[PDB]
């Protein structure tokens, strides 16, 4: 199976206080491993996974400095983006930064990304080649021109195609027990009839990782979405993930509806009918 | 590992 490392950073401005709330978190695939919180007592990068605890003072002092700076970088950006957009200092605004890399089965680089949104709309995103920039607003254009003049694209393509991948590998290995295990979905159906006219069949999937998954309903063996509910895939807090999907069926046709499960942990796709 | 280059103001 494939893998990614990604860092998510979030700066929200609290009017009347020149110090915003900063929250940075590091994922390797669907597994959190580090976090920073401008509010928390420590003001150091904190570990979350076991395997990242075996890094030494060098690692933490450095990751603490970098992410403190990411925060101070955002502190300013809010200052700027008010001018650039002409908005009130009375308003609380949001900057979000997300970067990381992908790798195939082979652990060889596949894709890098570095994206930025002001108030949860795209601002400036790095194109796939990692040499170009996509700006929407002329505010982004003014960034683009300043970021080309500090060779940012070049500067990141180094991290993303290089460092990002060199440490994703380090993590994947150093943390094999955590990260390279693939927990398969425990599946079943429930049948609660809503009347004597209809029946609701619910295809369940529990205690699985990674969070990627696909549940699909087939009436006489054809993909149905017409009467199909399908919940957002959700955590449990033990590091596994859950999802269900249901169809409403004319009672006496339960056996014509089958559920199709797909996951990395699954050797073959599962088929479910009513029992 | 966090980025230690690429990150500046806008």
């Amino acid at each position, epitope marked *: 199976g494939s893998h990614s490392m990604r860092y998510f950073f979030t700066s929200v401005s609290r009017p009347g206080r020149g110090e915003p709330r900063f929250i940075a978190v590091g994922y390797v695939d669907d597994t959190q491993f580090v976090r920073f919180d401008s509010d928390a007592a420590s003001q150091r990068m904190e570990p979350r996974a076991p395997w990242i605890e075996q890094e030494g003072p060098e*690692y933490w002092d450095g990751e603490t400095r970098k992410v403190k700076a990411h925060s101070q970088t955002h502190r*300013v950006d809010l200052g700027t983006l008010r001018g650039y957009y002409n908005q009130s200092e009375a308003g609380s605004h949001t900057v979000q930064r997300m970067y990381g890399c992908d790798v195939g089965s082979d652990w060889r680089f596949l894709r890098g990304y570095h994206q930025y949104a002001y108030d949860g709309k795209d601002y400036i995103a790095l194109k796939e080649d990692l040499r170009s920039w996509t700006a929407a607003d002329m505010a982004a254009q003014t960034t683009k021109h300043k970021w080309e003049a500090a060779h940012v694209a070049e500067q990141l393509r180094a991290y993303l195609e290089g460092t990002c991948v060199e440490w994703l590998r380090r993590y994947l290995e150093n943390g094999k027990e955590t990260l390279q295990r693939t927990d398969a979905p425990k599946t079943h159906m429930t049948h609660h009839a809503v009347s004597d006219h209809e029946a609701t069949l619910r295809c369940w999937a529990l205690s699985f990782y990674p969070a990627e998954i696909t549940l699909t309903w087939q009436r006489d063996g054809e993909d149905q979405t017409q009467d199909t509910e399908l919940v957002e895939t959700r955590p449990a807090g033990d590091g596994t993930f859950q999802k269900w999907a249901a169809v409403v069926v004319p009672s006496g046709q339960e056996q014509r509806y089958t559920c199709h499960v797909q996951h990395e942990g699954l050797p073959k796709p599962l088929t479910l009918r009513w029992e | 590992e966090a*980025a230690g*280059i690429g990150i500046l103001t806008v």
Partner: T-cell receptor
Amino acid sequence: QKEVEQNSGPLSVPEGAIASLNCTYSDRGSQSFFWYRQYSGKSPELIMSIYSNGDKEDGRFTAQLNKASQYVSLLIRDSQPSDSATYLCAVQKLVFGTGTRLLVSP
Amino acid sequence: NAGVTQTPKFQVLKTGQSMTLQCAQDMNHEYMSWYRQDPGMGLRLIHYSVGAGITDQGEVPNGYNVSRSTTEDFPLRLLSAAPSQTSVYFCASSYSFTEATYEQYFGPGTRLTVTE
């Protein structure tokens, strides 16, 4: 202090020959590398900075990085004697080595 | 304005004396730092702002307090002066940490001698 290790001179080259200055850093996953030039009695001065494997060319100065071997270097092709001064090596504009005192003897 | 500034340029001191070195830069530099350099050794980091109000300790922080009111100033103070502190102190700012292009300008340095 191991953080960043330098030649630790004095090094002495003849005029018009290439100077090679060498640096290794302890903290792996440093990603910025800077070369500073301090004349005796004066203050450090950024001359070169590399963030990416290979050779970066700036006139007579070339700077070299091998993130494999945790190594940074500096070529001064065609040394003049006004080049003679302490050269300081630095990771993420934060920690510096002792410095390598270069004497380009004319 | 003139990159980065320092006061004084040269200072004698009696062991066990209060003393502050000034540092200033009108460039909007969030990152700043303080170094000591002894003839022979090189730059050893004492403290560093990554921004206003944020300060961290470096490699040789003993003897030496620091402060970070305002983006502009980054003072350095010796509470009880010692010969062990007789050195050349440089103060450096860059627009950006976590970014290579932007230069790290150095002050003219303060040359400090402390005598019993």
